[PDB]
PDB file of N, CA and C (backbone and C1' of nucleotides) in Angstrom:
ATOM      1  N   UNK A   1     -73.946 -47.187  38.091  1.00  0.00           N
ATOM      2  CA  UNK A   1     -74.507 -47.481  36.786  1.00  0.00           C
ATOM      3  C   UNK A   1     -75.937 -46.996  36.582  1.00  0.00           C
ATOM      4  N   UNK A   2     -76.554 -47.155  35.410  1.00  0.00           N
ATOM      5  CA  UNK A   2     -77.895 -46.751  35.071  1.00  0.00           C
ATOM      6  C   UNK A   2     -78.740 -47.988  34.791  1.00  0.00           C
ATOM      7  N   UNK A   3     -80.032 -47.939  35.116  1.00  0.00           N
ATOM      8  CA  UNK A   3     -81.074 -48.860  34.702  1.00  0.00           C
ATOM      9  C   UNK A   3     -82.341 -48.222  34.132  1.00  0.00           C
ATOM     10  N   UNK A   4     -83.168 -48.929  33.355  1.00  0.00           N
ATOM     11  CA  UNK A   4     -84.397 -48.418  32.774  1.00  0.00           C
ATOM     12  C   UNK A   4     -85.721 -48.900  33.352  1.00  0.00           C
ATOM     13  N   UNK A   5     -86.395 -48.074  34.153  1.00  0.00           N
ATOM     14  CA  UNK A   5     -87.553 -48.515  34.910  1.00  0.00           C
ATOM     15  C   UNK A   5     -88.678 -47.508  34.689  1.00  0.00           C
ATOM     16  N   UNK A   6     -89.880 -47.988  34.334  1.00  0.00           N
ATOM     17  CA  UNK A   6     -91.032 -47.204  33.953  1.00  0.00           C
ATOM     18  C   UNK A   6     -90.793 -46.322  32.732  1.00  0.00           C
ATOM     19  N   UNK A   7     -90.018 -46.890  31.797  1.00  0.00           N
ATOM     20  CA  UNK A   7     -89.446 -46.263  30.616  1.00  0.00           C
ATOM     21  C   UNK A   7     -88.381 -45.219  30.884  1.00  0.00           C
ATOM     22  N   UNK A   8     -88.196 -44.782  32.139  1.00  0.00           N
ATOM     23  CA  UNK A   8     -87.175 -43.818  32.490  1.00  0.00           C
ATOM     24  C   UNK A   8     -85.757 -44.365  32.629  1.00  0.00           C
ATOM     25  N   UNK A   9     -84.718 -43.669  32.167  1.00  0.00           N
ATOM     26  CA  UNK A   9     -83.360 -43.990  32.563  1.00  0.00           C
ATOM     27  C   UNK A   9     -83.069 -43.406  33.936  1.00  0.00           C
ATOM     28  N   UNK A  10     -82.518 -44.072  34.951  1.00  0.00           N
ATOM     29  CA  UNK A  10     -82.155 -43.674  36.291  1.00  0.00           C
ATOM     30  C   UNK A  10     -80.945 -44.402  36.858  1.00  0.00           C
ATOM     31  N   UNK A  11     -80.256 -43.780  37.820  1.00  0.00           N
ATOM     32  CA  UNK A  11     -78.959 -44.074  38.382  1.00  0.00           C
ATOM     33  C   UNK A  11     -79.308 -44.987  39.554  1.00  0.00           C
ATOM     34  N   UNK A  12     -78.695 -46.169  39.508  1.00  0.00           N
ATOM     35  CA  UNK A  12     -78.651 -47.153  40.579  1.00  0.00           C
ATOM     36  C   UNK A  12     -77.154 -47.273  40.845  1.00  0.00           C
ATOM     37  N   UNK A  13     -76.614 -46.593  41.866  1.00  0.00           N
ATOM     38  CA  UNK A  13     -75.228 -46.740  42.246  1.00  0.00           C
ATOM     39  C   UNK A  13     -74.258 -46.212  41.194  1.00  0.00           C
ATOM     40  N   UNK A  14     -73.201 -46.944  40.856  1.00  0.00           N
ATOM     41  CA  UNK A  14     -72.254 -46.614  39.800  1.00  0.00           C
ATOM     42  C   UNK A  14     -72.694 -46.801  38.360  1.00  0.00           C
TER      43      UNK A  14
ATOM     44  O5'   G B   1     -71.131 -60.356  50.896  1.00  0.00           O
ATOM     45  C5'   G B   1     -70.475 -59.129  51.166  1.00  0.00           C
ATOM     46  C4'   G B   1     -68.971 -59.191  50.882  1.00  0.00           C
ATOM     47  C3'   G B   1     -68.644 -58.562  49.537  1.00  0.00           C
ATOM     48  O3'   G B   1     -68.479 -57.159  49.663  1.00  0.00           O
ATOM     49  C1'   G B   1     -67.668 -60.722  49.673  1.00  0.00           C
ATOM     50  P     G B   2     -68.664 -56.250  48.358  1.00  0.00           P
ATOM     51  O5'   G B   2     -67.525 -56.811  47.364  1.00  0.00           O
ATOM     52  C5'   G B   2     -66.179 -56.391  47.294  1.00  0.00           C
ATOM     53  C4'   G B   2     -65.516 -56.988  46.061  1.00  0.00           C
ATOM     54  C3'   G B   2     -66.148 -56.328  44.834  1.00  0.00           C
ATOM     55  O3'   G B   2     -65.715 -55.055  44.426  1.00  0.00           O
ATOM     56  C1'   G B   2     -65.818 -58.659  44.516  1.00  0.00           C
ATOM     57  P     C B   3     -66.593 -54.001  43.593  1.00  0.00           P
ATOM     58  O5'   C B   3     -66.342 -54.553  42.092  1.00  0.00           O
ATOM     59  C5'   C B   3     -65.254 -54.253  41.258  1.00  0.00           C
ATOM     60  C4'   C B   3     -65.386 -55.240  40.106  1.00  0.00           C
ATOM     61  C3'   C B   3     -66.535 -54.896  39.155  1.00  0.00           C
ATOM     62  O3'   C B   3     -66.178 -53.883  38.246  1.00  0.00           O
ATOM     63  C1'   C B   3     -66.501 -57.211  39.605  1.00  0.00           C
ATOM     64  P     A B   4     -67.317 -53.112  37.406  1.00  0.00           P
ATOM     65  O5'   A B   4     -68.012 -54.263  36.508  1.00  0.00           O
ATOM     66  C5'   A B   4     -67.312 -54.640  35.342  1.00  0.00           C
ATOM     67  C4'   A B   4     -68.184 -55.684  34.652  1.00  0.00           C
ATOM     68  C3'   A B   4     -69.467 -55.129  34.025  1.00  0.00           C
ATOM     69  O3'   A B   4     -69.273 -54.364  32.853  1.00  0.00           O
ATOM     70  C1'   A B   4     -69.758 -57.303  34.981  1.00  0.00           C
ATOM     71  P     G B   5     -70.099 -52.992  32.732  1.00  0.00           P
ATOM     72  O5'   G B   5     -71.611 -53.482  32.485  1.00  0.00           O
ATOM     73  C5'   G B   5     -72.002 -54.247  31.366  1.00  0.00           C
ATOM     74  C4'   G B   5     -73.379 -54.911  31.255  1.00  0.00           C
ATOM     75  C3'   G B   5     -74.615 -54.073  31.582  1.00  0.00           C
ATOM     76  O3'   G B   5     -74.988 -53.404  30.410  1.00  0.00           O
ATOM     77  C1'   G B   5     -74.560 -56.048  32.732  1.00  0.00           C
ATOM     78  P     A B   6     -76.181 -52.310  30.367  1.00  0.00           P
ATOM     79  O5'   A B   6     -77.572 -53.098  30.511  1.00  0.00           O
ATOM     80  C5'   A B   6     -78.294 -53.561  29.378  1.00  0.00           C
ATOM     81  C4'   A B   6     -79.466 -54.365  29.912  1.00  0.00           C
ATOM     82  C3'   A B   6     -80.675 -53.744  30.615  1.00  0.00           C
ATOM     83  O3'   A B   6     -81.380 -52.849  29.787  1.00  0.00           O
ATOM     84  C1'   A B   6     -80.208 -55.879  31.603  1.00  0.00           C
ATOM     85  P     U B   7     -82.469 -51.790  30.338  1.00  0.00           P
ATOM     86  O5'   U B   7     -83.767 -52.587  30.858  1.00  0.00           O
ATOM     87  C5'   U B   7     -84.488 -53.483  30.045  1.00  0.00           C
ATOM     88  C4'   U B   7     -85.786 -54.016  30.637  1.00  0.00           C
ATOM     89  C3'   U B   7     -86.945 -53.034  30.460  1.00  0.00           C
ATOM     90  O3'   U B   7     -87.895 -53.569  29.573  1.00  0.00           O
ATOM     91  C1'   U B   7     -86.840 -54.097  32.666  1.00  0.00           C
ATOM     92  P     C B   8     -87.570 -53.409  28.002  1.00  0.00           P
ATOM     93  O5'   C B   8     -86.432 -54.515  27.722  1.00  0.00           O
ATOM     94  C5'   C B   8     -86.846 -55.719  27.125  1.00  0.00           C
ATOM     95  C4'   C B   8     -85.673 -56.582  26.668  1.00  0.00           C
ATOM     96  C3'   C B   8     -84.744 -57.003  27.799  1.00  0.00           C
ATOM     97  O3'   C B   8     -85.188 -58.214  28.369  1.00  0.00           O
ATOM     98  C1'   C B   8     -83.530 -56.110  25.923  1.00  0.00           C
ATOM     99  P     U B   9     -84.448 -58.967  29.583  1.00  0.00           P
ATOM    100  O5'   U B   9     -85.593 -59.597  30.513  1.00  0.00           O
ATOM    101  C5'   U B   9     -86.126 -60.854  30.166  1.00  0.00           C
ATOM    102  C4'   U B   9     -87.028 -61.403  31.266  1.00  0.00           C
ATOM    103  C3'   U B   9     -88.020 -60.483  31.982  1.00  0.00           C
ATOM    104  O3'   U B   9     -89.143 -60.249  31.171  1.00  0.00           O
ATOM    105  C1'   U B   9     -86.836 -61.803  33.475  1.00  0.00           C
ATOM    106  P     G B  10     -90.169 -59.045  31.449  1.00  0.00           P
ATOM    107  O5'   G B  10     -90.127 -58.895  33.051  1.00  0.00           O
ATOM    108  C5'   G B  10     -89.379 -57.958  33.793  1.00  0.00           C
ATOM    109  C4'   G B  10     -89.469 -58.271  35.285  1.00  0.00           C
ATOM    110  C3'   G B  10     -90.214 -57.381  36.273  1.00  0.00           C
ATOM    111  O3'   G B  10     -91.619 -57.546  36.268  1.00  0.00           O
ATOM    112  C1'   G B  10     -88.228 -58.334  37.197  1.00  0.00           C
ATOM    113  P     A B  11     -92.593 -56.345  36.692  1.00  0.00           P
ATOM    114  O5'   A B  11     -92.350 -56.130  38.266  1.00  0.00           O
ATOM    115  C5'   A B  11     -92.962 -56.920  39.262  1.00  0.00           C
ATOM    116  C4'   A B  11     -92.492 -56.634  40.686  1.00  0.00           C
ATOM    117  C3'   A B  11     -92.892 -55.266  41.211  1.00  0.00           C
ATOM    118  O3'   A B  11     -94.171 -55.373  41.790  1.00  0.00           O
ATOM    119  C1'   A B  11     -90.586 -55.790  41.623  1.00  0.00           C
ATOM    120  P     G B  12     -94.927 -54.158  42.533  1.00  0.00           P
ATOM    121  O5'   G B  12     -94.260 -54.047  44.003  1.00  0.00           O
ATOM    122  C5'   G B  12     -94.549 -54.942  45.051  1.00  0.00           C
ATOM    123  C4'   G B  12     -94.001 -54.616  46.438  1.00  0.00           C
ATOM    124  C3'   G B  12     -94.408 -53.215  46.905  1.00  0.00           C
ATOM    125  O3'   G B  12     -95.726 -53.323  47.395  1.00  0.00           O
ATOM    126  C1'   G B  12     -92.085 -53.510  46.977  1.00  0.00           C
ATOM    127  P     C B  13     -96.796 -52.147  47.146  1.00  0.00           P
ATOM    128  O5'   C B  13     -96.051 -50.866  47.747  1.00  0.00           O
ATOM    129  C5'   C B  13     -95.905 -50.626  49.135  1.00  0.00           C
ATOM    130  C4'   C B  13     -94.929 -49.521  49.503  1.00  0.00           C
ATOM    131  C3'   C B  13     -95.412 -48.197  48.911  1.00  0.00           C
ATOM    132  O3'   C B  13     -96.416 -47.579  49.689  1.00  0.00           O
ATOM    133  C1'   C B  13     -93.077 -48.531  48.550  1.00  0.00           C
ATOM    134  P     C B  14     -97.197 -46.281  49.149  1.00  0.00           P
ATOM    135  O5'   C B  14     -96.125 -45.101  49.332  1.00  0.00           O
ATOM    136  C5'   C B  14     -95.883 -44.336  50.490  1.00  0.00           C
ATOM    137  C4'   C B  14     -94.725 -43.381  50.193  1.00  0.00           C
ATOM    138  C3'   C B  14     -95.138 -42.229  49.281  1.00  0.00           C
ATOM    139  O3'   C B  14     -95.847 -41.411  50.191  1.00  0.00           O
ATOM    140  C1'   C B  14     -92.919 -42.968  48.793  1.00  0.00           C
ATOM    141  P     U B  15     -96.534 -40.029  49.734  1.00  0.00           P
ATOM    142  O5'   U B  15     -95.470 -38.975  50.338  1.00  0.00           O
ATOM    143  C5'   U B  15     -95.739 -38.327  51.562  1.00  0.00           C
ATOM    144  C4'   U B  15     -94.585 -37.433  51.995  1.00  0.00           C
ATOM    145  C3'   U B  15     -93.483 -37.261  50.961  1.00  0.00           C
ATOM    146  O3'   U B  15     -93.620 -36.227  50.012  1.00  0.00           O
ATOM    147  C1'   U B  15     -92.519 -37.710  53.089  1.00  0.00           C
ATOM    148  P     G B  16     -92.860 -36.287  48.595  1.00  0.00           P
ATOM    149  O5'   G B  16     -93.981 -37.008  47.692  1.00  0.00           O
ATOM    150  C5'   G B  16     -93.861 -38.371  47.380  1.00  0.00           C
ATOM    151  C4'   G B  16     -92.745 -38.605  46.361  1.00  0.00           C
ATOM    152  C3'   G B  16     -92.777 -37.657  45.171  1.00  0.00           C
ATOM    153  O3'   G B  16     -91.424 -37.321  44.917  1.00  0.00           O
ATOM    154  C1'   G B  16     -92.785 -39.905  44.423  1.00  0.00           C
ATOM    155  P     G B  17     -90.927 -36.152  43.934  1.00  0.00           P
ATOM    156  O5'   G B  17     -91.236 -36.716  42.448  1.00  0.00           O
ATOM    157  C5'   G B  17     -90.403 -37.669  41.832  1.00  0.00           C
ATOM    158  C4'   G B  17     -90.734 -38.093  40.400  1.00  0.00           C
ATOM    159  C3'   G B  17     -91.079 -36.939  39.474  1.00  0.00           C
ATOM    160  O3'   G B  17     -90.336 -37.028  38.279  1.00  0.00           O
ATOM    161  C1'   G B  17     -92.709 -38.666  39.309  1.00  0.00           C
ATOM    162  P     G B  18     -89.092 -36.036  38.012  1.00  0.00           P
ATOM    163  O5'   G B  18     -87.971 -36.844  38.836  1.00  0.00           O
ATOM    164  C5'   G B  18     -87.280 -36.189  39.878  1.00  0.00           C
ATOM    165  C4'   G B  18     -86.372 -37.269  40.469  1.00  0.00           C
ATOM    166  C3'   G B  18     -85.339 -37.811  39.490  1.00  0.00           C
ATOM    167  O3'   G B  18     -84.000 -37.783  39.950  1.00  0.00           O
ATOM    168  C1'   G B  18     -86.491 -39.541  40.713  1.00  0.00           C
ATOM    169  P     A B  19     -82.832 -37.750  38.840  1.00  0.00           P
ATOM    170  O5'   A B  19     -81.524 -38.105  39.718  1.00  0.00           O
ATOM    171  C5'   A B  19     -81.371 -39.363  40.335  1.00  0.00           C
ATOM    172  C4'   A B  19     -80.163 -39.540  41.244  1.00  0.00           C
ATOM    173  C3'   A B  19     -79.920 -38.322  42.133  1.00  0.00           C
ATOM    174  O3'   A B  19     -79.512 -38.646  43.448  1.00  0.00           O
ATOM    175  C1'   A B  19     -78.059 -38.666  40.754  1.00  0.00           C
ATOM    176  P     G B  20     -80.546 -39.309  44.486  1.00  0.00           P
ATOM    177  O5'   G B  20     -81.335 -40.562  43.851  1.00  0.00           O
ATOM    178  C5'   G B  20     -82.683 -40.450  43.442  1.00  0.00           C
ATOM    179  C4'   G B  20     -83.647 -40.552  44.619  1.00  0.00           C
ATOM    180  C3'   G B  20     -83.502 -41.716  45.591  1.00  0.00           C
ATOM    181  O3'   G B  20     -82.624 -41.487  46.680  1.00  0.00           O
ATOM    182  C1'   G B  20     -85.703 -41.508  44.917  1.00  0.00           C
ATOM    183  P     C B  21     -81.862 -42.616  47.533  1.00  0.00           P
ATOM    184  O5'   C B  21     -83.007 -43.244  48.463  1.00  0.00           O
ATOM    185  C5'   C B  21     -83.600 -42.688  49.609  1.00  0.00           C
ATOM    186  C4'   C B  21     -84.447 -43.769  50.272  1.00  0.00           C
ATOM    187  C3'   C B  21     -83.816 -45.152  50.395  1.00  0.00           C
ATOM    188  O3'   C B  21     -82.949 -45.394  51.496  1.00  0.00           O
ATOM    189  C1'   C B  21     -85.948 -45.398  49.495  1.00  0.00           C
ATOM    190  P     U B  22     -81.700 -46.397  51.347  1.00  0.00           P
ATOM    191  O5'   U B  22     -82.361 -47.791  50.889  1.00  0.00           O
ATOM    192  C5'   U B  22     -82.075 -48.320  49.621  1.00  0.00           C
ATOM    193  C4'   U B  22     -83.108 -49.407  49.330  1.00  0.00           C
ATOM    194  C3'   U B  22     -82.601 -50.784  48.962  1.00  0.00           C
ATOM    195  O3'   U B  22     -82.176 -51.558  50.058  1.00  0.00           O
ATOM    196  C1'   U B  22     -84.521 -50.129  47.655  1.00  0.00           C
ATOM    197  P     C B  23     -81.298 -52.899  49.877  1.00  0.00           P
ATOM    198  O5'   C B  23     -82.312 -53.981  49.263  1.00  0.00           O
ATOM    199  C5'   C B  23     -83.071 -54.827  50.104  1.00  0.00           C
ATOM    200  C4'   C B  23     -84.032 -55.774  49.381  1.00  0.00           C
ATOM    201  C3'   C B  23     -83.401 -56.828  48.483  1.00  0.00           C
ATOM    202  O3'   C B  23     -83.025 -58.049  49.067  1.00  0.00           O
ATOM    203  C1'   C B  23     -85.246 -55.690  47.431  1.00  0.00           C
ATOM    204  P     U B  24     -81.904 -59.040  48.477  1.00  0.00           P
ATOM    205  O5'   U B  24     -82.471 -59.332  47.005  1.00  0.00           O
ATOM    206  C5'   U B  24     -83.551 -60.220  46.828  1.00  0.00           C
ATOM    207  C4'   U B  24     -84.169 -60.382  45.439  1.00  0.00           C
ATOM    208  C3'   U B  24     -83.206 -61.032  44.463  1.00  0.00           C
ATOM    209  O3'   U B  24     -83.245 -62.436  44.521  1.00  0.00           O
ATOM    210  C1'   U B  24     -84.286 -59.163  43.475  1.00  0.00           C
ATOM    211  P     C B  25     -82.071 -63.312  43.855  1.00  0.00           P
ATOM    212  O5'   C B  25     -82.109 -62.805  42.332  1.00  0.00           O
ATOM    213  C5'   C B  25     -82.983 -63.475  41.446  1.00  0.00           C
ATOM    214  C4'   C B  25     -82.934 -63.074  39.978  1.00  0.00           C
ATOM    215  C3'   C B  25     -81.866 -63.702  39.087  1.00  0.00           C
ATOM    216  O3'   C B  25     -82.460 -64.886  38.601  1.00  0.00           O
ATOM    217  C1'   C B  25     -82.046 -61.337  38.740  1.00  0.00           C
ATOM    218  P     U B  26     -81.762 -66.318  38.826  1.00  0.00           P
ATOM    219  O5'   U B  26     -80.491 -66.248  37.829  1.00  0.00           O
ATOM    220  C5'   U B  26     -80.671 -66.322  36.443  1.00  0.00           C
ATOM    221  C4'   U B  26     -79.601 -65.655  35.574  1.00  0.00           C
ATOM    222  C3'   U B  26     -78.140 -65.968  35.848  1.00  0.00           C
ATOM    223  O3'   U B  26     -77.723 -67.141  35.182  1.00  0.00           O
ATOM    224  C1'   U B  26     -78.578 -63.638  35.470  1.00  0.00           C
ATOM    225  P     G B  27     -76.260 -67.779  35.412  1.00  0.00           P
ATOM    226  O5'   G B  27     -75.168 -66.722  34.880  1.00  0.00           O
ATOM    227  C5'   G B  27     -74.715 -66.759  33.552  1.00  0.00           C
ATOM    228  C4'   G B  27     -73.646 -65.741  33.143  1.00  0.00           C
ATOM    229  C3'   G B  27     -72.256 -65.962  33.743  1.00  0.00           C
ATOM    230  O3'   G B  27     -71.450 -66.828  32.982  1.00  0.00           O
ATOM    231  C1'   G B  27     -72.975 -63.650  33.888  1.00  0.00           C
ATOM    232  P     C B  28     -70.986 -68.237  33.615  1.00  0.00           P
ATOM    233  O5'   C B  28     -69.666 -67.923  34.475  1.00  0.00           O
ATOM    234  C5'   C B  28     -68.348 -67.833  33.986  1.00  0.00           C
ATOM    235  C4'   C B  28     -67.801 -66.451  34.339  1.00  0.00           C
ATOM    236  C3'   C B  28     -66.758 -66.568  35.442  1.00  0.00           C
ATOM    237  O3'   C B  28     -65.504 -67.147  35.132  1.00  0.00           O
ATOM    238  C1'   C B  28     -67.993 -64.598  35.694  1.00  0.00           C
ATOM    239  P     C B  29     -64.784 -68.113  36.188  1.00  0.00           P
ATOM    240  O5'   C B  29     -64.263 -67.267  37.455  1.00  0.00           O
ATOM    241  C5'   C B  29     -63.142 -66.417  37.371  1.00  0.00           C
ATOM    242  C4'   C B  29     -62.896 -65.772  38.737  1.00  0.00           C
ATOM    243  C3'   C B  29     -63.039 -66.723  39.923  1.00  0.00           C
ATOM    244  O3'   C B  29     -61.880 -67.509  40.029  1.00  0.00           O
ATOM    245  C1'   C B  29     -64.017 -64.710  40.475  1.00  0.00           C
TER     246        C B  29
END
RNA sequence: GGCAGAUCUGAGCCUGGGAGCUCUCUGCC
């Protein structure tokens, strides 16, 4: 899946 | 353990600036 950290979208696992 | 989902609660640190190294949350089983 994806999460939003430091305004960026990024891939955490599935 | 399994699955769902958010920085719209969050965060350590980098041989960073990311399909990074990851810890944590809260929903259900």
